[PDB]
Design a protein around this ligand. Sequence first.
Ligand SMILES: NC(=O)c1ccc[n+]([C@@H]2O[C@H](COP(=O)([O-])OP(=O)(O)OC[C@H]3O[C@@H](n4cnc5c(N)ncnc54)[C@H](O)[C@@H]3O)[C@@H](O)[C@H]2O)c1
Ligand SMILES: NC(=O)c1ccc[n+]([C@@H]2O[C@H](COP(=O)([O-])OP(=O)(O)OC[C@H]3O[C@@H](n4cnc5c(N)ncnc54)[C@H](O)[C@@H]3O)[C@@H](O)[C@H]2O)c1
Ligand SMILES: NC(=O)c1ccc[n+]([C@@H]2O[C@H](COP(=O)([O-])OP(=O)(O)OC[C@H]3O[C@@H](n4cnc5c(N)ncnc54)[C@H](O)[C@@H]3O)[C@@H](O)[C@H]2O)c1
Ligand SMILES: NC(=O)c1ccc[n+]([C@@H]2O[C@H](COP(=O)([O-])OP(=O)(O)OC[C@H]3O[C@@H](n4cnc5c(N)ncnc54)[C@H](O)[C@@H]3O)[C@@H](O)[C@H]2O)c1
Ligand SMILES: CCNC(=O)[C@@H]1C[C@@H](NC(=O)c2cc(CC)nn2C)CN1C(=O)c1coc2ccccc12
Ligand SMILES: CCNC(=O)[C@@H]1C[C@@H](NC(=O)c2cc(CC)nn2C)CN1C(=O)c1coc2ccccc12
Ligand SMILES: CCNC(=O)[C@@H]1C[C@@H](NC(=O)c2cc(CC)nn2C)CN1C(=O)c1coc2ccccc12
Ligand SMILES: CCNC(=O)[C@@H]1C[C@@H](NC(=O)c2cc(CC)nn2C)CN1C(=O)c1coc2ccccc12
Lengths: 268, 268, 268, 268
Amino acid sequence: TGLLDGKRILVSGIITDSSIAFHIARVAQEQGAQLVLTGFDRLRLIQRITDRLPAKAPLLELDVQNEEHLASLAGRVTEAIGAGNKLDGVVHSIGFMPQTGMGINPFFDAPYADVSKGIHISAYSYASMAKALLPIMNPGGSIVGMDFDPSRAMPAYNWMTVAKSALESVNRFVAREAGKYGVRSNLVAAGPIRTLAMSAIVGGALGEEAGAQIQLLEEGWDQRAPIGWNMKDATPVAKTVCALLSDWLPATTGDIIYADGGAHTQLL
Amino acid sequence: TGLLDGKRILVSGIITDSSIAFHIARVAQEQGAQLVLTGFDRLRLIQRITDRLPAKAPLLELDVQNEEHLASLAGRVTEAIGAGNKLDGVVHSIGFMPQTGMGINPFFDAPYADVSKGIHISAYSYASMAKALLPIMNPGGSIVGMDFDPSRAMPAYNWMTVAKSALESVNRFVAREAGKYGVRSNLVAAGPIRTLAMSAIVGGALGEEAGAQIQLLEEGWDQRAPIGWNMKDATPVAKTVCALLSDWLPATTGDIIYADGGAHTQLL
Amino acid sequence: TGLLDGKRILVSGIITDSSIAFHIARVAQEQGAQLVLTGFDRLRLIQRITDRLPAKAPLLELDVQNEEHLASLAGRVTEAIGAGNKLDGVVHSIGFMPQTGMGINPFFDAPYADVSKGIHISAYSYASMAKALLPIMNPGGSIVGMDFDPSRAMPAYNWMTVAKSALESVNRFVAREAGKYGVRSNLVAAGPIRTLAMSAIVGGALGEEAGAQIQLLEEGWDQRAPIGWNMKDATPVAKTVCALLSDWLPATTGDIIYADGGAHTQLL
Amino acid sequence: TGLLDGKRILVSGIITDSSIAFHIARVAQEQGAQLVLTGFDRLRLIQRITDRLPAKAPLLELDVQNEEHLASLAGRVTEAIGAGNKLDGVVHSIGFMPQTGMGINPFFDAPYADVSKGIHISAYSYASMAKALLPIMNPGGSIVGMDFDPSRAMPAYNWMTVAKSALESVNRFVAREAGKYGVRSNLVAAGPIRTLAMSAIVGGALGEEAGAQIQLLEEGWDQRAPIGWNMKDATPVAKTVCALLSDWLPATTGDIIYADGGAHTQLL
Ligand SMILES: NC(=O)c1ccc[n+]([C@@H]2O[C@H](COP(=O)([O-])OP(=O)(O)OC[C@H]3O[C@@H](n4cnc5c(N)ncnc54)[C@H](O)[C@@H]3O)[C@@H](O)[C@H]2O)c1
Ligand SMILES: NC(=O)c1ccc[n+]([C@@H]2O[C@H](COP(=O)([O-])OP(=O)(O)OC[C@H]3O[C@@H](n4cnc5c(N)ncnc54)[C@H](O)[C@@H]3O)[C@@H](O)[C@H]2O)c1
Ligand SMILES: NC(=O)c1ccc[n+]([C@@H]2O[C@H](COP(=O)([O-])OP(=O)(O)OC[C@H]3O[C@@H](n4cnc5c(N)ncnc54)[C@H](O)[C@@H]3O)[C@@H](O)[C@H]2O)c1
Ligand SMILES: NC(=O)c1ccc[n+]([C@@H]2O[C@H](COP(=O)([O-])OP(=O)(O)OC[C@H]3O[C@@H](n4cnc5c(N)ncnc54)[C@H](O)[C@@H]3O)[C@@H](O)[C@H]2O)c1
Ligand SMILES: CCNC(=O)[C@@H]1C[C@@H](NC(=O)c2cc(CC)nn2C)CN1C(=O)c1coc2ccccc12
Ligand SMILES: CCNC(=O)[C@@H]1C[C@@H](NC(=O)c2cc(CC)nn2C)CN1C(=O)c1coc2ccccc12
Ligand SMILES: CCNC(=O)[C@@H]1C[C@@H](NC(=O)c2cc(CC)nn2C)CN1C(=O)c1coc2ccccc12
Ligand SMILES: CCNC(=O)[C@@H]1C[C@@H](NC(=O)c2cc(CC)nn2C)CN1C(=O)c1coc2ccccc12
């Protein structure tokens, strides 16, 4: 029936209805998956958003910078899905970089405290999540993370591109660990998407120039992409994550699957 | 329901029940795809082999080097699927390299006549097949080709590695043409599989040093791979082709997916 | 004392004074190298160009497609540099792709005959050259080839990009064969340069659309390049070839050195 | 004529005579470079070590984790080379990762505080150094960092690989900043060298398992290398850094140059 029919998947990262994790959770539910969701900080707002999903799914609090939340994760998840029952999928749609290391502040000027917070959330946490959830994962299982091609440097992205470079390395190692459990670990490298991750720069909140630079990136992304790129559509990226959570890419681990319209394969 | 339900797919490259294409065809038929099969040279024998598939499919002759075969291909494929109906998928599982450019023969002792023969069949033919079948493809279609990671040089593979490097470049350009049709173009880079592509070197036909060279590569592949690698199992590769033929990787084009157990992501 | 002082280098690829090879030859000679030059087709015309070099260097005929020129090459070089004397360096600055495979002809409309000729001259010839000169090369030696980054597809380059992909793979295997002689084999991936290789598309011989598209590429290259890119200055490329010909990159082989202003490291 | 005649070069990262930076400093001096050295913690040790170098050079103190050191560095460098004089080269041979992130400790057991210390010292400090030293750098200058290929996961290295992956990214953005000063920024990706960076794992201090892992890697590195690899000789690496500090690679920036024997270019 569904692509993930009878699968128990954990989906992290829903904040708004435009969050990549929301469309991942939506497509996953449409494809028969039973979900457990994790949210950070504004939990009464996340509960309101996740209520708009095709189905009821338990919401658990998880700050990946909180040692206690990580220590109790597996326990709280098992309680949510029933004892003796395990996870088949894990979705890491978590990331952040403070305004000093991303946007208009000069690259050099970002303090290591802010860069460190950014690497802990967007890169180190991918391993943190796998450490906590892998002992409650079933053989054949899948851990998918969200990436943004960091092989080439670009304007404004700055220390987020550095944190993504680190995430890619982490993923490669997580795969070594996950393989002992019969679990795959991969990243989906998406093109730009109009979520909370971009809303300040796009909305002219960092100035007119900053907004212009992103619009050139989104325009150029669409040009290069042989099959086009709609920065307003999160569903192609959502579908890709669901391909990796399914049993249809069973010899793929420690890798990057590009869901970007084909932009990264083209120069112009 | 089936992953490729209601999809019309052409599958090329079946020569034995062990061929990568045989597994792609069987898996696709299991997932409700209506196939058309192209075969080369020994067709009376290909029909005997294709009769072993889960369902009956039309068998057409196609020599990628015969221009009459290529020019008639769309018309002949149409005749088989019926007028008004178009293809939703194309599988290119065709490769060849003369003995002078592959195995024990010294890399410098390969006549260009033979390297050109190998590049025509292994690389150029991917653009030829796309040229012929793109006019009879439906928007959202998928063209998948078979790859063996040529990013690093290896013993024995020699000019076949060169042919594969040319192929990755062809794929990137086919994606550009295919995009105009709303069609995706990708390659599945597989790990070594015990087909007729490897039978001579493996069966000790190119001497001891050549067979030992392969064994070391083969062993190293399975140990590098975080989830392992089985040369005697084409099913994980076959599932990956089907994953790309499906609607679940809709933002991936001009790209390479690695169905290699994750081996290319590890040094040791 | 010069960077290539007392070195015997063979430099191929001079046709006009705008050629990359001419600049490689000028600088190498400026750096104390003893040269042996190889030209193709119109050698009386090439001799009138090589007369404009800082020093007198013997000129030898070499059509890379001519099986007799390669079989007799090493003998002609030894006769030119003196018996008992060996080459310390070799420069491959050869490339060609017919009008059907490059420019405004549809990528699909290139006949294999024409593609094969361009692959013979631009990739296979690098291996032909090394087969010929490795036996008359000194340990510590250096074979350098010219490349144009083929990792990402682009407009108008078409089958030349496919041949540059083939070349990259060929170099990797050449480094294997060369290492048995203590010789390094590498590619210098240069950005675009105003030579006879680009003069038609730059000059409008291919129409407005074509011209506009190459200008866009040039503009963007210099934009992306953190140190800038001047398509009218072959000197930084020549200097890079000389660096690989020296003993200053002694642990680098089967590789690509980018002399492109850093363009390939920047998305925009 | 020395390759670096009259070039005021800052060299960081000396601790012993086996340190990569010591050999970089030695060759730079052998090549007529005027040096300013930077040392950390054990400054009496570094002084005794630098006294063995070909010439007398000022040794300044720099802990990359200390903001006072970084802010004062530029003025202290000016004082050393002379008023009205700027640097022509800057060498970053600094790196560190605690035992929790490197060795036998499981990848999932490395606390973020430690991973963060490693990334601070190994990746972030490259930007810090450039931030401080670019305003006292001359046009045509070079910033060179030390790297160890992080594109593939491997045993033991774990989080240092994650840090190197981040360093590559930082270098790519440093090139964007340096380009404004007419300065190139690059990394030398070396193969493994018997320095203090490896001495614990090679010496058997992390047990048999860990020791055997390095043994396999070191042996594998030499067999993959077409020109070979000797981990007891840093001079080829040292030369390569000097090649990047010179005017012979003037079109290369935001890049990685592999002084690894060509090991990264071969699978076997
Ligand atoms: N939008 C894009 O252009 C784009 C492109 C490629 C990749 N991505 C990545 O996709 C992922 C999802 O981002 P998005 O674009 O949907 O933005 P988003 O802000 O909608 O989602 C990111 C999530 O990260 C969460 N988060 C932040 N700090 C956290 C902490 N300490 N603990 C737990 N969760 C925390 C936020 O609450 C939010 O739910 C991120 O990794 C992002 O880098 C985004
Ligand atoms: N098994 C491996 O080691 C391996 C690994 C990665 C990729 N591949 C690729 O997968 C594909 C399928 O190979 P396989 O491993 O199943 O072995 P195979 O020998 O069964 O497949 C090769 C196919 O190409 C066909 N062919 C050869 N010349 C042709 C021509 N002129 N016209 C039309 N068809 C022609 C053959 O008849 C055969 O069916 C090839 O492209 C191969 O390079 C193989
Ligand atoms: N100009 C650029 O933008 C650019 C960029 C990157 C790489 N390159 C490469 O540099 C190399 C030199 O090209 P160039 O830019 O100096 O232009 P060019 O056209 O002046 O030089 C190419 C040389 O290749 C020679 N050649 C062609 N067919 C031959 C054959 N059968 N045998 C022997 N020699 C033959 C030509 O006679 C010519 O001397 C080529 O490999 C080219 O692909 C050029
Ligand atoms: N030997 C290898 O296997 C290898 C391979 C590739 C790259 N490298 C790199 O080469 C560089 C030098 O390493 P090495 O092999 O010479 O070993 P090393 O231990 O001699 O060098 C590390 C240096 O970093 C300095 N350092 C450490 N912490 C610091 C801090 N907080 N502030 C300032 N300086 C600090 C020390 O003075 C020390 O000299 C490093 O970046 C290393 O990662 C080493
Ligand atoms: C609610 C207002 N949102 C913001 O401020 C967000 C939060 C933060 N995004 C993130 O962490 C973030 C970015 C990404 C994409 C890889 N994946 N993630 C989680 C930055 N940012 C912006 O808009 C931008 C400001 O400079 C930019 C430069 C490039 C792209 C976005 C912004
Ligand atoms: C039935 C007789 N088989 C053979 O001779 C086959 C046919 C031919 N393979 C092919 O073209 C071929 C190889 C591949 C894998 C990428 N994909 N394809 C179509 C060569 N080869 C061998 O075994 C080998 C001889 O050296 C080798 C070195 C490495 C691998 C195989 C052989
Ligand atoms: C003398 C008149 N010039 C030409 O016709 C040359 C000869 C031929 N170049 C070559 O083989 C050639 C090209 C390159 C660069 C990698 N390296 N090499 C030897 C094509 N070409 C052109 O201008 C172009 C026509 O479409 C183009 C698209 C892109 C770039 C150039 C042209
Ligand atoms: C003082 C005795 N040596 C040590 O303890 C050193 C110091 C520290 N290495 C470093 O920071 C370090 C390592 C490297 C190479 C990229 N570049 N750098 C700055 C760890 N380490 C070891 O030997 C190793 C322990 O597991 C290992 C696994 C692989 C390689 C070395 C060790």
